[PDB]
Scaffold this motif. Structure first.
Motif, PDB file in Angstrom:
ATOM      1  N   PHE A   9       0.815  -1.212   0.000  1.00 10.87           N
ATOM      2  CA  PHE A   9       0.000   0.000   0.000  1.00 10.87           C
ATOM      3  C   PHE A   9       0.850   1.265   0.000  1.00 10.87           C
ATOM      4  N   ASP A  10       2.073   1.202   0.537  1.00  9.40           N
ATOM      5  CA  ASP A  10       2.924   2.388   0.584  1.00  9.40           C
ATOM      6  C   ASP A  10       3.241   2.900  -0.815  1.00  9.40           C
ATOM      7  N   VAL A  11       3.555   1.993  -1.739  1.00 10.28           N
ATOM      8  CA  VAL A  11       4.008   2.405  -3.062  1.00 10.28           C
ATOM      9  C   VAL A  11       2.831   2.872  -3.907  1.00 10.28           C
ATOM     10  N   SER A  33      14.378  -0.462   6.442  1.00  7.48           N
ATOM     11  CA  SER A  33      14.208   0.551   5.409  1.00  7.48           C
ATOM     12  C   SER A  33      12.778   0.410   4.907  1.00  7.48           C
ATOM     13  N   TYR A  34      12.051   1.523   4.840  1.00  9.24           N
ATOM     14  CA  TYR A  34      10.793   1.542   4.109  1.00  9.24           C
ATOM     15  C   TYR A  34      11.020   1.438   2.601  1.00  9.24           C
ATOM     16  N   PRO A  35      10.040   0.915   1.863  1.00  9.92           N
ATOM     17  CA  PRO A  35      10.199   0.719   0.416  1.00  9.92           C
ATOM     18  C   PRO A  35       9.703   1.846  -0.482  1.00  9.92           C
ATOM     19  N   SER A  36       9.346   3.005   0.072  1.00  5.97           N
ATOM     20  CA  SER A  36       9.088   4.207  -0.710  1.00  5.97           C
ATOM     21  C   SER A  36      10.309   5.106  -0.769  1.00  5.97           C
ATOM     22  N   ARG A  37      11.138   5.070   0.274  1.00  2.00           N
ATOM     23  CA  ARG A  37      12.450   5.713   0.297  1.00  2.00           C
ATOM     24  C   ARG A  37      13.402   4.673   0.882  1.00  2.00           C
ATOM     25  N   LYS A  38      13.915   3.795   0.020  1.00  2.43           N
ATOM     26  CA  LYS A  38      14.814   2.722   0.432  1.00  2.43           C
ATOM     27  C   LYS A  38      16.286   3.102   0.326  1.00  2.43           C
ATOM     28  N   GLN A  47      18.697   4.212   5.174  1.00  2.00           N
ATOM     29  CA  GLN A  47      18.186   3.310   6.194  1.00  2.00           C
ATOM     30  C   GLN A  47      17.546   4.140   7.300  1.00  2.00           C
ATOM     31  N   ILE A  48      16.446   3.630   7.844  1.00  2.25           N
ATOM     32  CA  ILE A  48      15.724   4.287   8.934  1.00  2.25           C
ATOM     33  C   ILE A  48      16.222   3.864  10.311  1.00  2.25           C
ATOM     34  N   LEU A  49      16.422   2.562  10.509  1.00  5.13           N
ATOM     35  CA  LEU A  49      16.980   1.996  11.730  1.00  5.13           C
ATOM     36  C   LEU A  49      18.190   1.117  11.470  1.00  5.13           C
ATOM     37  N   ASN A  80      13.947  12.292  19.041  1.00 10.86           N
ATOM     38  CA  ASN A  80      13.473  13.328  18.136  1.00 10.86           C
ATOM     39  C   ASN A  80      12.792  12.704  16.919  1.00 10.86           C
ATOM     40  N   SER A  81      12.122  13.553  16.141  1.00  6.22           N
ATOM     41  CA  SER A  81      11.360  13.081  14.993  1.00  6.22           C
ATOM     42  C   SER A  81      12.285  12.470  13.948  1.00  6.22           C
ATOM     43  N   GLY A  82      11.966  11.243  13.535  1.00  7.75           N
ATOM     44  CA  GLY A  82      12.718  10.532  12.520  1.00  7.75           C
ATOM     45  C   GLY A  82      13.513   9.338  13.009  1.00  7.75           C
ATOM     46  N   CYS A  83      13.327   8.907  14.260  1.00  3.49           N
ATOM     47  CA  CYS A  83      14.117   7.837  14.860  1.00  3.49           C
ATOM     48  C   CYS A  83      13.372   6.502  14.909  1.00  3.49           C
ATOM     49  N   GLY A  84      12.301   6.351  14.137  1.00 10.34           N
ATOM     50  CA  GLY A  84      11.639   5.057  14.019  1.00 10.34           C
ATOM     51  C   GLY A  84      11.001   4.550  15.294  1.00 10.34           C
ATOM     52  N   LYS A  85      10.311   5.424  16.029  1.00  8.93           N
ATOM     53  CA  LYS A  85       9.562   4.977  17.201  1.00  8.93           C
ATOM     54  C   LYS A  85       8.319   4.204  16.781  1.00  8.93           C
ATOM     55  N   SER A  86       7.512   4.791  15.898  1.00  8.72           N
ATOM     56  CA  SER A  86       6.368   4.071  15.349  1.00  8.72           C
ATOM     57  C   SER A  86       6.829   2.856  14.553  1.00  8.72           C
ATOM     58  N   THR A  87       8.006   2.948  13.924  1.00  7.75           N
ATOM     59  CA  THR A  87       8.559   1.839  13.151  1.00  7.75           C
ATOM     60  C   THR A  87       8.715   0.598  14.021  1.00  7.75           C
ATOM     61  N   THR A  88       9.268   0.770  15.226  1.00 11.81           N
ATOM     62  CA  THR A  88       9.283  -0.284  16.240  1.00 11.81           C
ATOM     63  C   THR A  88       7.907  -0.924  16.392  1.00 11.81           C
ATOM     64  N   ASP A 121       0.672   4.033  19.808  1.00 12.08           N
ATOM     65  CA  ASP A 121       1.488   4.913  18.974  1.00 12.08           C
ATOM     66  C   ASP A 121       0.811   6.273  18.961  1.00 12.08           C
ATOM     67  N   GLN A 122       1.277   7.126  19.873  1.00 15.16           N
ATOM     68  CA  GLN A 122       0.737   8.463  20.059  1.00 15.16           C
ATOM     69  C   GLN A 122      -0.744   8.373  20.403  1.00 15.16           C
ATOM     70  N   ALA A 123      -1.055   7.584  21.446  1.00 12.58           N
ATOM     71  CA  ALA A 123      -2.443   7.446  21.879  1.00 12.58           C
ATOM     72  C   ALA A 123      -3.045   8.816  22.137  1.00 12.58           C
TER      73      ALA A 123
HETATM   74  N1  LIG Z   1       3.849   6.059   4.275  1.00 13.21           N
HETATM   75  C1  LIG Z   1       5.189   5.982   4.459  1.00 13.21           C
HETATM   76  N2  LIG Z   1       5.980   5.387   3.538  1.00 13.21           N
HETATM   77  C2  LIG Z   1       7.314   5.295   3.690  1.00 13.21           C
HETATM   78  N3  LIG Z   1       7.962   5.784   4.762  1.00 13.21           N
HETATM   79  C3  LIG Z   1       7.296   6.406   5.764  1.00 13.21           C
HETATM   80  C4  LIG Z   1       5.839   6.544   5.668  1.00 13.21           C
HETATM   81  N4  LIG Z   1       5.449   7.190   6.783  1.00 13.21           N
HETATM   82  C5  LIG Z   1       6.557   7.446   7.530  1.00 13.21           C
HETATM   83  N5  LIG Z   1       7.660   6.978   6.912  1.00 13.21           N
HETATM   84  C6  LIG Z   1       9.068   7.043   7.389  1.00 13.21           C
HETATM   85  O1  LIG Z   1       9.191   6.717   8.776  1.00 13.21           O
HETATM   86  C7  LIG Z   1      10.441   7.248   9.219  1.00 13.21           C
HETATM   87  C8  LIG Z   1      10.440   7.466  10.727  1.00 13.21           C
HETATM   88  O2  LIG Z   1       9.290   8.202  11.136  1.00 13.21           O
HETATM   89  P1  LIG Z   1       8.513   7.827  12.498  1.00 13.21           P
HETATM   90  O3  LIG Z   1       7.166   7.247  12.136  1.00 13.21           O
HETATM   91  O4  LIG Z   1       9.443   7.078  13.420  1.00 13.21           O
HETATM   92  O5  LIG Z   1       8.287   9.268  13.169  1.00 13.21           O
HETATM   93  P2  LIG Z   1       7.852   9.371  14.715  1.00 13.21           P
HETATM   94  O6  LIG Z   1       9.001   8.873  15.560  1.00 13.21           O
HETATM   95  O7  LIG Z   1       6.481   8.755  14.868  1.00 13.21           O
HETATM   96  O8  LIG Z   1       7.739  10.965  14.905  1.00 13.21           O
HETATM   97  P3  LIG Z   1       6.334  11.656  15.279  1.00 13.21           P
HETATM   98  O9  LIG Z   1       5.815  10.850  16.445  1.00 13.21           O
HETATM   99  O10 LIG Z   1       6.717  13.075  15.623  1.00 13.21           O
HETATM  100  O11 LIG Z   1       5.528  11.518  14.010  1.00 13.21           O
HETATM  101  C9  LIG Z   1      10.678   8.511   8.397  1.00 13.21           C
HETATM  102  O12 LIG Z   1      12.054   8.553   7.994  1.00 13.21           O
HETATM  103  C10 LIG Z   1       9.735   8.396   7.207  1.00 13.21           C
HETATM  104  O13 LIG Z   1      10.429   8.398   5.951  1.00 13.21           O
END
Ligand SMILES: Nc1ncnc2c1ncn2[C@@H]1O[C@H](COP(=O)(O)OP(=O)(O)OP(=O)(O)O)[C@@H](O)[C@H]1O
Length: 1182
Positions: free
Chosen positions: A129-131, A366-371, A374-376, A394-402, A521-523
């Protein structure tokens, strides 16, 4: 690209493989069925020709010649009439089977496609769905599936019909003598060639046109989005000329299409009238020499042209079948695509007694829209069972990615994620997500009841357990106060719930699931401190003894956690309890301290629009009569030919009569080419004028409208560009083109009715009684093909709305693991349009059958009755053909006309909208020229008890008894709680709206009595998001004081006083730099300063500042504020103040609440008042 034909018919059951076969055999029969109708028609003239000259030339017997020859015709025509009816009988059966079985087999296949295609989408990955663009995907569910049903339905049965006539027709032509055919088939390449050439030239002037108006239609779109700025700066005429000076391009181009379209008509209309003579001149010479008979030629000439025209009737049925292959490619790819993470499979383990040991091992991702990046990188960390782990950084450290990796919504590349010692990629996905409760950033509520939205978490839960969970989630008491309690309907359709209430429903949903692991994730993010507190109590409740990962935004959440991980650049720099990280004085410590439409327009009114070019109309009418008269002429010249060889004559006159009439075709053929070339040169320019002249009058009349019009939901900036673009042009199919029709139709059926009546009136009253019947049938088919299109396609909106609900929140449902539920919901909704379509083919089986049967049957009801008229010596066989081919070939002509011309219904309503947008006169005539316009530059402003309601939503009252003075040169600040009342004052001094009651005065004078241009010329609008125009800096600035000499000197002094001069002078292409989307993108801060600079050039006595500083550019903000102090100095100023610091230096403050001025005064007096104003300044302090 496209699909191989044999693939595309997969999902066709053995009965569908049968229906398509049986239905084809019908189509082959029906294909050859008209060639037989032409063969008999030949053998019928032979029966007439054999006797037609006996009874005339030599008078052997009077009554022993009557009965001899006439009881022969009476017995010959019994068979020819029994033969004709036999066809229509077989057609009636056959035609049913054709469209019945094909629409059935297609329908049966679609219902198997919809379910397999949706399921395929619910089975995809989350990186899938990302692409992809989801918007076109949802339309691809109902548009592409609708594009296939064309090219597998009845559109095939018509194709095998046309090919069975192409070979069936060229067969009969050849076996009934080969000389005549190879004449024609030497010319039909000239016509198969002539057809395609023009379609290359019509397609040429098409795409050139869409790029011609794209210049004019771009200025249109920019204005009607920026309408607030255009009116406020009075550039309503400057935009009329830009839209017009680009509007002559698409006119001249519109003529080269208009001429060359009617050339293409008359050009090919000539080669028919040419190849008619060539085929008849040569055809008469083969009956004179007694090689053919008259019945032989008339078979072959028709039986070729039918089979020869059968290609052109199968052109679109191929194109619809090739469109269907092509749309079927994008769909079949998804069905055959199989994911790595299969949300439906039943493969992995389902481990019990899950304690929640959590382990991350060397995670890279790595996400597959910007591969590329590397994110983590090398992320390692354990959460011990039942403990809470807060992720910070800070913003961009892959917290939601976890959190996305523990949902397993992507598969990490390197490293390993384990639960209780077990690779999470080695258990099953549904068991995994069943044990995991997802609290998203934003909660998705489904358009269903609250019971169902909660039950979506687990469809078997009892209503007792629902009550328990809603309690635990803290959402019960608010539910108890709703009117339809647990049955209340929520979503987009129903009552809007607050942010706090939506999240607690999501919490209750997760409780129902009773998972062993919780992910948040940001409840709480968007929620205010009051809404957040109830949710925190309910979160804290839900967590008590569960293993939890929380993406924490609020400091208070983090402080009570059992362990904190600090993330920086994918790397945990420090991990510990709260006190350790504070002690560390690293990253975490720095964070926690800083934060502290159906109009009935008449045909006559539309016609008046083109009245300025009546001389063009007179000519087009004239040639519309001639061209409408050439058809009944041909009906004679065809009859008079065949009359010679079927009524009686000497072979001395068969030469001169035939060749004369044979060359009267090319008399007619030339006149065809001339009257079309001239019809489309006069009615052609008449239309291409009309478009250009109406787009101007519209766009002029559109900027005349007041702001209440452009505030309406229906007059959005897009629906007006459409209305300004194609609806403005679609009128011309109802002014000249409608006269061309009716003058053709009158000159055709008029003069054709007359002729047939005199040559014999008995046959005509039959035909003009039956033409009503067959003419009706072509309409009801067009209706019920369309009236059924609504029904089947309306029952699909529910089936499509279900899918829309599921795709638009795909990330949610996959986390709830209800991919199957929505699949079932789709299928159950689809059972209605299925059973309807299985009756549809039964219907269209009949409407197609009884059209051709009443035509093949009625073909007998004419040549039977007409024959008895020759037995009784009341009419000649020539006169039959002079009736038949003067009504029928003339009645077929209006259809060949009416189906070419534009859709008249679609054009009138398309025009009726244009007249309304023109004839509308506004409440506030901005174009006007009257008003006082004195030389008094005081600018005393006064609102007295102004009462006003927005006419978009007049049920909402805003202002009640608003009275207030602004003294000359003073600054007035407007303050109060969020509301439109404060903004309204700016719109009323602008006079964008009138007030309902009360009075607005300017220097003692009513603003309704001062020219709107000279009211607004001394008023400066500073918008929130200032509109910058795609244009030079000079022009965007010149937008303020229009119709003015402004030179280079005057531009520079103003740019100084906005404080931008120094920044401008070092930039490239300095004052010439193109700004807009094409050019250098300006920041938020820079744009507003341009709006300020524009206001300085105007040098008004009053300044209206509305919600300025709607950006986050910190340095720019102080730059704006510096520039603003400059811009206000010694000027009368009205500021809509949101920031407290702006308020401090103002000369007067007005506190407004619910239309009411609760208090006012200088800064110091409102603080010491200790009222409403005092409350605002106190909250920011602590
Ligand atoms: N739909 C998407 N497709 C590809 N990559 C994404 C998408 N949404 C977010 N990202 C990627 O996720 C990476 C990390 O963002 P993350 O979700 O960790 O932010 P965050 O820690 O939740 O910050 P905040 O809580 O302030 O939003 C970014 O580098 C971004 O490129």
């Amino acid at each position: 690209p496209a699909v191989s034909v044999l693939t595309m018919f997969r999902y066709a059951g053995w009965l569908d493989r049968l229906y398509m076969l049986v239905g084809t055999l019908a189509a082959i029969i029906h294909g050859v069925a008209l060639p037989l109708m032409m063969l008999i028609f030949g053998d019928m003239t032979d029966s007439f020709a054999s006797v037609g000259n006996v009874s005339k030339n030599s008078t052997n017997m009077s009554e022993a010649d009557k009965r001899a020859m006439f009881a022969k015709l009476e017995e010959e025509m019994t068979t020819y009439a029994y033969y004709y009816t036999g066809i229509g009988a077989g057609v009636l059966i056959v035609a049913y089977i054709q469209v019945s079985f094909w629409c059935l087999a297609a329908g049966r296949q679609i219902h198997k496609i919809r379910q397999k295609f949706f399921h395929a989408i619910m089975n995809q990955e989350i990186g899938w769905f990302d692409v992809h663009d989801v918007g076109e995907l949802n339309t691809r569910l109902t548009d592409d599936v609708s594009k296939i049903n064309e090219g597998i339905g009845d559109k095939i049965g018509m194709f095998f019909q046309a090919m069975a006539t192409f070979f069936g027709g060229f067969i009969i032509g050849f076996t009934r003598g080969w000389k005549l055919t190879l004449v024609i088939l030497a010319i039909s390449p000239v016509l198969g060639l002539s057809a395609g050439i023009w379609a290359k030239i019509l397609s040429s002037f098409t795409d050139k046109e869409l790029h011609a108006y794209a210049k004019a239609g771009a200025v249109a779109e920019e204005v009607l989005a920026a309408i607030r700025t255009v009116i406020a700066f009075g550039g309503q005429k400057k935009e009329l000329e830009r839209y017009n000076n680009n509007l002559e391009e698409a006119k001249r181009l519109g003529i080269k299409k208009a001429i060359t379209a009617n050339i293409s008509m008359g050009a090919a209309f000539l080669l028919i009238y040419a190849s008619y003579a060539l085929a008849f001149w040569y055809g008469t010479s083969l009956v004179i020499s007694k090689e053919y008979s008259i019945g032989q030629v008339l078979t072959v000439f028709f039986s070729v042209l039918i089979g020869a025209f059968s290609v052109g009737q199968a052109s679109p049925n191929i194109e619809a079948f090739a469109n269907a292959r092509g749309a079927a490619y994008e769909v079949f790819k998804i069905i055959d695509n199989k994911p790595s993470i299969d949300s439906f499979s039943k493969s992995g383990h389902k481990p019990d007694n899950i304690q929640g040991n959590l382990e991350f091992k060397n995670i890279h991702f790595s996400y597959p829209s910007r591969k590329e990046v590397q994110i983590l990188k090398g992320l390692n960390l354990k959460v011990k069972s039942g403990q809470t782990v807060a992720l910070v950084g800070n913003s961009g450290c892959g917290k939601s990615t976890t959190v996305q990796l523990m949902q397993r919504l992507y598969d990490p590349l390197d490293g390993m994620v384990s639960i209780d010692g077990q690779d999470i990629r080695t258990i099953n996905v549904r068991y995994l997500r069943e044990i995991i409760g997802v609290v998203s950033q934003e909660p998705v509520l489904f358009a269903t009841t609250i019971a169902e939205n909660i039950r979506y978490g687990r469809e078997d839960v009892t209503m007792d357990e629902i009550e328990k969970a809603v309690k635990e989630a803290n959402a019960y008491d608010f539910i108890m106060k709703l009117p339809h309690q647990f049955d209340t309907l929520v979503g987009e359709r129903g009552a809007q719930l607050s942010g706090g209430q939506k999240q607690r429903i999501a919490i209750a949903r997760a409780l129902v699931r009773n998972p062993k692991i919780l992910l948040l994730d940001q409840a709480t993010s968007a929620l205010d401190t009051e809404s957040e507190a109830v949710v925190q109590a309910a979160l804290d409740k839900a967590r008590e003894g569960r293993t939890t990962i929380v993406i924490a935004h609020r400091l208070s959440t983090v402080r009570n956690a059992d362990v904190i991980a600090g993330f920086d650049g994918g790397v945990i720099v420090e991990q510990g309890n709260h006190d350790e990280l504070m002690r560390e004085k690293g990253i975490y410590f720095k964070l926690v301290m800083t934060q502290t439409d159906v109009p009935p327009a008449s045909f006559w009114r539309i016609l008046k629009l083109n009245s300025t070019e009546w001389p063009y109309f007179v000519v087009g009418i004239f040639c519309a009569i001639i061209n409408g008269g050439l058809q009944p002429a041909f009906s004679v010249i065809f009859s008079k030919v065949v009359g010679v060889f079927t009524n009686g004559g000497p072979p001395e006159t068969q030469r001169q009569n035939s060749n004369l009439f044979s060359l009267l075709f090319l008399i007619l053929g030339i006149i065809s080419f001339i009257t079309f070339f001239l019809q489309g040169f006069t009615f052609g320019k008449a239309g291409e004028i009309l478009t250009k002249r109406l787009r101007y009058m519209v766009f002029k009349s559109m900027l005349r409208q007041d702001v209440s019009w452009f505030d309406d939901p229906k007059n959005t900036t897009g629906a007006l560009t459409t209305r300004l673009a194609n609806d403005a042009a679609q009128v011309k199919g109802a002014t000249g083109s409608r006269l061309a029709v009716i003058f053709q139709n009158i000159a055709n059926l008029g003069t054709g009715i007359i002729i047939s009546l005199i040559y014999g009136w008995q046959l005509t009253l039959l035909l003009l009684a039956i033409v009503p019947i067959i003419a009706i049938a072509g309409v009801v088919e067009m209706k019920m093909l369309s009236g059924q299109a609504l029904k089947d396609k309306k029952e699909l909106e529910g089936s499509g709305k279900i899918a829309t609900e599921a795709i638009e929140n795909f990330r949610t449902v996959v986390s709830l693991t209800r991919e199957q539920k929505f699949e079932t919901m789709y299928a159950q909704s689809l059972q209605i349009p299925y059973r309807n379509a299985m009756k549809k083919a039964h219907v269209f089986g009949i409407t197609f059958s009884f059209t051709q049967a009443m035509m093949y049957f009625s073909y007998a009801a004419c040549f039977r009755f007409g024959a008895y008229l020759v037995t009784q010596q009341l009419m000649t066989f020539e006169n039959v053909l002079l009736v038949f081919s003067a009504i029928v070939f003339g009645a077929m002509a209006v259809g060949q006309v009416s189906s070419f011309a534009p859709d008249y219904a679609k054009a009138t309503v398309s025009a009726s909208h244009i007249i309304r947008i023109i004839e509308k006169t506004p409440e506030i005539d901005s174009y006007s020229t009257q008003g006082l316009k004195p030389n008094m530059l005081e600018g005393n402003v006064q609102f007295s008890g102004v009462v006003f309601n927005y006419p978009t939503r007049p049920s909402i009252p805003v202002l009640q008894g608003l009275s207030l003075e602004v003294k000359k040169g003073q600054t007035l600040a407007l303050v109060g709680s969020s509301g439109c009342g404060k903004s309204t004052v700016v719109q009323l001094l602008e006079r964008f709206y009138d007030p309902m009651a009360g009075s607005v005065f300017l220097d003692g004078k009513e603003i309704k009595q001062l020219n709107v241009q000279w009211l607004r010329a001394q008023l400066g609008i500073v918008s929130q998001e200032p509109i910058l125009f795609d244009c030079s800096i000079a022009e965007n600035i010149a937008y303020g004081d229009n119709s003015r000499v402004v030179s280079y000197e005057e531009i520079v002094r103003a740019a100084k006083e906005a404080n931008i001069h120094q920044f401008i002078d070092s930039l490239p292409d300095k004052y010439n730099t193109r700004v807009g989307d094409k050019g250098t993108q300006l920041s938020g801060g820079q744009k507003q300063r341009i709006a300020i600079a524009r206001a300085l050039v105007r040098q008004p006595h009053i300044l209206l500042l509305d919600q300025a500083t709607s950006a986050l550019d910190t340095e720019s903000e102080k730059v704006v504020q510096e520039a603003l102090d400059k811009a206000r100095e010694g000027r009368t100023c009205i500021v809509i103040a949101h920031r407290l610091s702006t308020i401090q230096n103002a000369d007067l403050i007005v506190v407004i609440q619910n239309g009411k001025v609760k208090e006012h005064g200088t800064h110091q007096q409102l603080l010491a008042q200790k009222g409403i104003y005092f409350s605002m300044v106190s909250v920011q302090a602590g």
